[PDB]
Amino acid sequence: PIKTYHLSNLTQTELLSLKSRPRISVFDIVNPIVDDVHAHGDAAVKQYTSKFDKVDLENIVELVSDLPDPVLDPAIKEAFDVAYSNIYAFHAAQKSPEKSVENMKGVQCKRVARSINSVGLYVPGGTAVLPSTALMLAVPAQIAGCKTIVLANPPTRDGTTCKEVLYCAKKAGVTHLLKAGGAQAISAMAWGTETCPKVEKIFGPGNQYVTAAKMILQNSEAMVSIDMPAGPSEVLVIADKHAIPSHVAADLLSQAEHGPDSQVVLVIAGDGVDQNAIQEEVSKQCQSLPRGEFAAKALSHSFIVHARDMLEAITFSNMYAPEHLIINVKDAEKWESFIENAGSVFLGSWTPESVGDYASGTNHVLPTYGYARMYSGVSLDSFLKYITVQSLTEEGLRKLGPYVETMAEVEGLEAHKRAVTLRLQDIEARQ
Amino acid sequence: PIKTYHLSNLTQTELLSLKSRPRIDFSSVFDIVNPIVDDVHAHGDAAVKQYTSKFDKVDLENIVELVSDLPDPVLDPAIKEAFDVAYSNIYAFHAAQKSPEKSVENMKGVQCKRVARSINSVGLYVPGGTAVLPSTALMLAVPAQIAGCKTIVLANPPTRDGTTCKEVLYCAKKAGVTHLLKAGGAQAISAMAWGTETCPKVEKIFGPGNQYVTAAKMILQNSEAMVSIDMPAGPSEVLVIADKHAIPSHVAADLLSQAEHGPDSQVVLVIAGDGVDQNAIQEEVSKQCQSLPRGEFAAKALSHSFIVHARDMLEAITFSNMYAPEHLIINVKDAEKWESFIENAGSVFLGSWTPESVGDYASGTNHVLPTYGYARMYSGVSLDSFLKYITVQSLTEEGLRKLGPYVETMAEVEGLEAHKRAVTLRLQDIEA
Ligand SMILES: N[C@H](CO)Cc1c[nH]c[nH+]1
Ligand SMILES: N[C@H](CO)Cc1c[nH]c[nH+]1
Ligand SMILES: [Zn+2]
Ligand SMILES: [Zn+2]
């Protein structure tokens, strides 16, 4: 059965242990791959693609324009169109109006949005089918107006990429498909090749080799940033005595099935909760799951924390900073103001995380590992730069400029002072 | 004389090489900086003290002080009035970036929203030694203050005599800084990232610094320290676009304003169109630089600076977007009309009466901005830099009945039966 803790008892040391996921080295094997793709373009990408993926491709980048539209079963198409629709609407609503701030008359300042010109989106491939991720990444890129959108998705063993991913890629305006994975794919995007466009920002979780390539390349002469660390998936469920045990169990298992390193945490808030029934439901439901071996492995390092009340339970969750938080408690919505650290939040009894994973409209590319303490999930803003713009009239300069001279003199920066002084003289000499 | 290029002459390799700043490749700096970081990680306050003694020439018993325990310095009235004006303009501009948090309900019973929450603990790097940078203290502390950050650590190396300057302290107090870390360099960054015996561990570290500070930030964002950073914000850069209507002495003063920051600064002049007297700008630069206290720094920055001729404004702004400057001053006729063409720039100053100095100090925009070409994908510090945006969703039964079937389909396609069953089990119990 799952390990149980009583929150009031926990020492500082035990709490720090609870908030730390299983630990992380990788950089040694990845750099030669990075450097090689940097030095030898596509040819090296293909060598690593034969070794690691067992696929011989002559054309590792396709213009998505040149690809035929995939053939989908109509129920599948319909569902992906609903996901697109909701994700599009949710992300499109994040556009900021851009208004002038004019505190001092003649001193006009504004913040404007510009798209990142070129972006790379990594979606695991081969046997993986992750059209959901393709949408979570490409839809905001589409909305932001990124000119080049490269999607890295390694092909199946017969040279062909997952058709559901292609469908989503075409719907969301992906320009280039990079039929490749791993660190070779990342480096290809960060550095550019003969046929791969160079990108300015790389998004999307992958394996150790992907994450490592991303982390190396962000600090490199490639001049590239990345979205976040987004490692093994996580869910923290808060449940009280009104939660249905089989539903609580099903939510825990929904993310535990992602892999044996996933982390799942149940916080029981208050009295009257049937922990035996929950445990019982977890074991039974896990036994009948196709991926029950991954889930059982993930549950082997999962845990239950008992909190005296909802306030203590949310306090624990805030310390943990879970990728996903499900709050299955009475009047869940009222607790929103107490949430501090959580990638994405699911409120009430009819909101399994599965809905956010797939089609609610929110983005499932989210910070794991504790990184929700300082990173947000992918959003429209992840694809934008905000440039500040200011303009002064003569009068504006007369009002503000003397303050600036004063401050510059204080810092010992006389040239900063004189850029103002010379202009004020010129204004006086015509006035 | 400043080196000159004509865009229409250059090959692609030549053109692309003008993107390069006068900075060391990152790996060389990581070698210099790594052992410092690990030293502070292993050995705490002792290591920081050792570095502060060696490099800042000061022996401190307390390297961290609680700001509430420090005296309120007394400032000359005019100085005080000027910083209070800057505070007020920076506050107003940043406070206006607060987002409304409207609910989206595409499908009935499917409600989603994005809400802002502050980063709990932040570290702010204010450069020092012979730099006095109270302006940067405001640029960083004011938005932290507006966001609600609970722990705010300000790091600032003690000046020649061995003291944190009083103007930095005034600004820190007015903006709610909680702790002052009286160190600088990569050892300051490490102390904040890892925490020490007396330095709070922070979640995010902000601020401009020299090549070594910047490299420390970049290294620690990949570390097990669990820390993020704002951006690579290194030595200041300005690109000025000037036409025939620009006054040459004003153009020269703008270039020099930022050249004086240090020998590793870079300044670019792009002449747009005809009629510009480049020799007058050059003479004006030379004459002005010779009268500057820091003319030495400025002359060294100018040695890797250059002038580019562009046939028109379109080509000028295209070049600027490639360079991707920290700061862009557009001193051309109808400057405001060119705003739509600007793609990569940290902060832009439009017209003839808008020297970068005003945004450096008090216009209200943020001066902590990406350098090196990082304006291609990073923004300057803003309110959002101090926030996380959490997505929140809630479905009614009706919402789940409508959306849930699509979710089951998608989860089936991906081979994720447990994701499907968290919906199916709810829908079955509804139907029972
Ligand atoms: N739970 C994952 C991280 O948000 C996303 C996902 C995709 N498919 C199923 N789940
Ligand atoms: N130009 C610097 C980087 O934006 C900011 C500054 C402070 N004091 C004078 N200038
Ligand atoms: Zn999932
Ligand atoms: Zn400056």
Between helix A245-256 and helix B417-431 the angle, nearest 10°, is 160
Q: Residue count of chain B, please give it.
A: 432
Q: Nearest CA to B213 among B150, B124, B130, B273?
A: B124
Instruction: Spell out where chain A is interrupted, by the residue before each break (C to N > 2.5 A).
Output: 24
Cα first-last separation, chain B: 86
| Domain A98-112+389-428, CATH number (from 3.40.50.1370, 2.30.30.40, 3.30.200.20, 1.20.5.1300) | 1.20.5.1300
Q: Nearest CA to B152 among B208, B97, B186, B199?
A: B199
Say if residue A324 carries a ligand binding annotation: yes
The region that residue B388 occupies, defined by phi over 0 for left and psi between -120 and 50 for alpha, beta otherwise, is beta
A28's CB contacts (< 8 A; 6+ apart) are none
Contact flag B395-A348 (C-beta cutoff 8 Å) = yes
Contact flag B104-A117 (C-beta cutoff 8 Å) = no
CATH 1.10.10.10 fits domain A26-94+113-226+379-385 = no
| A contacts of B357 (beta carbons < 8 Å) | 404, 408, 416-417, 419-420
| Residue of the CA atom closest to atom 1 of ligand 1 | A357
For an interface test with A, the pick among B24, B421, B423, B424 (most A C-beta atoms closer than 10 Å) comes out as B421
Say if residue B34 carries a ligand binding annotation: no
For B182, the token pair is 């009286």
Cα gap B113→A73, rounded to integer Å: 32
Backbone angles phi, psi at B292, to 5 degrees: -95, 135
- Report how far apart, in Å, the C-alpha atoms of A143 and of each of A259, B68, B304, B321 are: 32, 46, 39, 21
Rounded to the nearest angstrom, the minimum Cα separation between A181 and chain B is 18
Contact flag B403-A223 (C-beta cutoff 8 Å) = no
Cα gap B385→B388, rounded to integer Å: 8
Say if residue B210 carries a ligand binding annotation: yes
Task: Give the CA radius of gyration of chain B.
Answer: 25
> Which among B133, B387, B422 has the least Cβ separation from residue A251?
B422
Ligand with smallest separation from the Cα of B208: 2
Question: Separation of A295 CA from ligand 1 center, angstroms?
Answer: 14
Cα gap A124→A130, rounded to integer Å: 7
Whether B328 contacts B348, CB under 8 Å: yes
Cα gap B322→B387, rounded to integer Å: 30
Whether B353 contacts B346, CB under 8 Å: no
Just list the catalytic residues of A: 323-324
Q: What is the largest CA-CA distance in chain A?
A: 87
Is the shortest distance between the CB of B360 and ligand 2 below 6 Å? yes
Say if residue B250 carries a ligand binding annotation: no
Q: What is the DSSP letter of A101?
A: B
Cα gap B40→B48, rounded to integer Å: 6
Contact flag A377-B365 (C-beta cutoff 8 Å) = no
| B contacts of A93 (beta carbons < 8 Å) | 102, 104
Contact flag B203-A109 (C-beta cutoff 8 Å) = no
Q: What is chain B's percent helix, strand, coil content, to nearest 5?
A: 45, 15, 35
Q: Nearest CA to A391 among A114, A113, A101, A115?
A: A101
DSSP string, B320-344: HHHH--SEEEEESTTGGGGGGG--S
Say if residue A42 carries a ligand binding annotation: no
The helix (run of H) or strand (run of E) holding residue A13 is helix A12-19
Cα first-last separation, chain A: 85
| B contacts of A377 (beta carbons < 8 Å) | 389, 391
Cα gap B10→B17, rounded to integer Å: 10
Residue B391 identity: T
Contact flag A388-B107 (C-beta cutoff 8 Å) = no
Cα B17 → chain centroid: 24
b/e sequence A390-427, b meaning 16+ C-beta within 10 Å: bbbebebbbbbbbbbbbbbebbebbbbbbbbbbbbebb
Q: Tell me which fold the domain B26-97+116-229+382-388 belongs to.
A: Rossmann fold (3.40.50)
In A, minimum Cα distance to B95 occurs at: A101
DSSP string, B367-429: -----TTGGGT-PPP-GGGGEEEEEEEEE-HHHHHHHHHHHHHHHHHHT-HHHHHHHHHHHHH
Ligand with smallest separation from the Cα of A232: 1
A217's CB contacts (< 8 A; 6+ apart) are A34, A186, A187, A190, A202, A224, A226
Q: Nearest CA to B264 among B310, B219, B307, B213?
A: B213
Just list the catalytic residues of B: 326-327
b/e sequence A360-380, b meaning 16+ C-beta within 10 Å: bbbbbbbbbbbbbbbbbbbbb
Q: What is chain A's percent helix, strand, coil content, to nearest 5?
A: 45, 15, 35
Q: Nearest CA to B407 among A254, A288, A232, A289?
A: A254
CATH of domain B4-22+235-364+370-378: 3.40.50.1980
| Domain A4-22+232-361+367-375, CATH number (from 3.40.50.1980, 3.30.565.10, 3.10.28.10, 3.40.50.300) | 3.40.50.1980
> Among A413, A418, A420, which residue has the most ligand 2 atoms within 8 Å of its CB, making it the best to mutate?
A413
DSSP string, A385-417: EEEEEEEE-HHHHHHHHHHHHHHHHHHT-HHHH
- Report how far apart, in Å, the C-alpha atoms of A9 and of each of A4, A5, B338 are: 12, 8, 63
For an interface test with A, the pick among B341, B413, B427 (most A C-beta atoms closer than 10 Å) comes out as B413
Q: One fold for both B4-22+235-364+370-378 and B26-97+116-229+382-388?
A: yes
CB pairs under 8 A between A and B: 401
Rounded to the nearest angstrom, the minimum Cα separation between B218 and chain A is 6
Surface-to-core class of residue A39, CB atoms within 10 Å of its CB (0-12 exposed, 13-18 middle, 19+ buried)? exposed
| Residue of the CA atom closest to atom 9 of ligand 1 | A357
Whether A325 contacts A342, CB under 8 Å: yes
Neighbours of A142 (CB within 10 A): 20
Is the shortest distance between the CB of A233 and ligand 1 below 6 Å? yes
Contact flag A215-B204 (C-beta cutoff 8 Å) = no
Resolution to 1 decimal place, in Å? 2.0
At the second CATH level, the architecture of B101-115+392-431 is: Up-down Bundle (1.20)
Residue spans of the domains in chain A: they are 4-22+232-361+367-375, 26-94+113-226+379-385, 98-112+389-428
Cα gap A242→B84, rounded to integer Å: 54
